[PDB]
Design a protein around this ligand. Sequence first.
Ligand SMILES: [Ca+2]
Ligand SMILES: [Zn+2]
Ligand SMILES: [Zn+2]
Length: 503
Amino acid sequence: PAARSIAATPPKLIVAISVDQFSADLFSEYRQYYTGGLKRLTSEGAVFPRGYQSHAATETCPGHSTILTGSRPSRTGIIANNWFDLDAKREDKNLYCAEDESQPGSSSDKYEASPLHLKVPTLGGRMKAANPATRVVSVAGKDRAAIMMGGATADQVWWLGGPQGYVSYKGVAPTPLVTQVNQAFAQRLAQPNPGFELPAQCVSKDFPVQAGNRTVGTGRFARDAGDYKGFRISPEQDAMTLAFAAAAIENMQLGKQAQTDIISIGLSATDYVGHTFGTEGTESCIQVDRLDTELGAFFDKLDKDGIDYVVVLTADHGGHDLPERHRMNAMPMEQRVDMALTPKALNATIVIWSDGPSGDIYYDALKYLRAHPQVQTVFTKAEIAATPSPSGPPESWSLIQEARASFYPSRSGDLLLLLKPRVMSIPEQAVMGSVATHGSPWDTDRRVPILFWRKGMQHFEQPLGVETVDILPSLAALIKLPVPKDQIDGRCLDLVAGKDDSC
Ligand SMILES: [Ca+2]
Ligand SMILES: [Zn+2]
Ligand SMILES: [Zn+2]
């Protein structure tokens, strides 16, 4: 395409895409096979293959809270998907990251979605504050993804709610756009999927791996009509979320008005697939290839609409394969966390509250945990609080620096438990659900791609570490939106190769 600087003029539409659990490892592995939307981003864009969700709590909610805020979880206050507030009024002291726990009859298992917990504005919030004509849209496969990318002043915030399709906050009625999208969704759900044949690059991954009662490695997303769980844990939900995003962009004429609009898009399938099957089998392989194809179709659609958009694509965190397959592929030391460290057992052994066998622990320990062979280390609250907000290259932060980046005194635990590398925080069970997960302070789970693209820009690759908190000021520079450096943690990334500087 004709040469044109990414910063020549303000883009009219910002498109922010978070691919859930799209780790730099997974991205890098299949990079040579992209032919569609991911090929466009990597061959033509500003490529940061070593981006960081730099904090320790490498989960969905903290991760999405960084992408469009320029703020680490230490500032957003979103320190995990769940944390305890033992002073909460209601019986259930466990709080969901994206709920309003003050709502009566609520619990972490039955909550009302809300951006209440988020302490800073999003990029959309900042744009709207500077210019009220700005539209801010956020759609995703998970409520916490949509909510944290959009922020409290977003115009439209929609997420996949179950077999009924996309929904929003309590009281928000489906619009003509949404009923039409949900009509299309219901039609798709009502069709069988015979499955996807393997892309050439997925053929090598086609072998079964046992993990407890389960077998993974060979799935092709065959499913019955009406099987919503199958739909959810498949490339199909991403295709739908992108179709939704495209329909919203066109219906609302985003990017076709005087001011810049913004839409954030949380593509959730890669994460469900990674949890359910691990990351190196046919299932993830098919999903990443479909992701490439569907993003291609999406970008082509916006292109044909004549929209001047800039794209940023990244992930909310990385990911990690199930130990059972790692042990087959030259990593014999990979293992599952001792059942003794899970919440009930650990409390009985040690009086404490915890949501899993790592992360924040709350007093209603050090000696037992530090002696355990699978435990890397345990920080006290005071130790973390004593640590200054980290700066410098995120690829070489210490563990306590990582902890400090997702430390928020009024929400964080009294202890922070960190497991050794290559310990999967899902214990072995006769019957298992998820076989793999992220959430560790280690590089597989922190390291994510950050890709920027606008038609005609000059490609470059920058392999040194950057942070996802850098995304907001990078984008804000393009639209000449002032963002005081003292209100955020990130720095502006120059997106103009060579001498000129977008910052
Ligand atoms: Ca430059
Ligand atoms: Zn996630
Ligand atoms: Zn996940």
